[PDB]
Amino acid sequence: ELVLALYDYQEKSPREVTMKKGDILTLLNSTNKDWWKVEVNDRQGFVPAAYVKKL
Secondary structure: OEEOOOOOOOOOOOEEEEEEOOEEEEEEEOOOOEEEEEOOOOEEEEEHHHEEEEE
C-alpha cells in the first residue's frame, strides 16, 4: 500500500523517519492507530498515522 505524506514530519526518536509533504511512502505496518511503519526510500521507521493518507 502507498500513503501520501500530508505534512512534513521530522524524526524525533530512533524508531522514526523523516518525510516531506508530498512524499509517497510504502506502508509496511498500520496495525497501531497512532504510528505507522513506512519506508521512505531505503529507510524504514514510524511516522504519525494522522499525517498520511492511504491511496
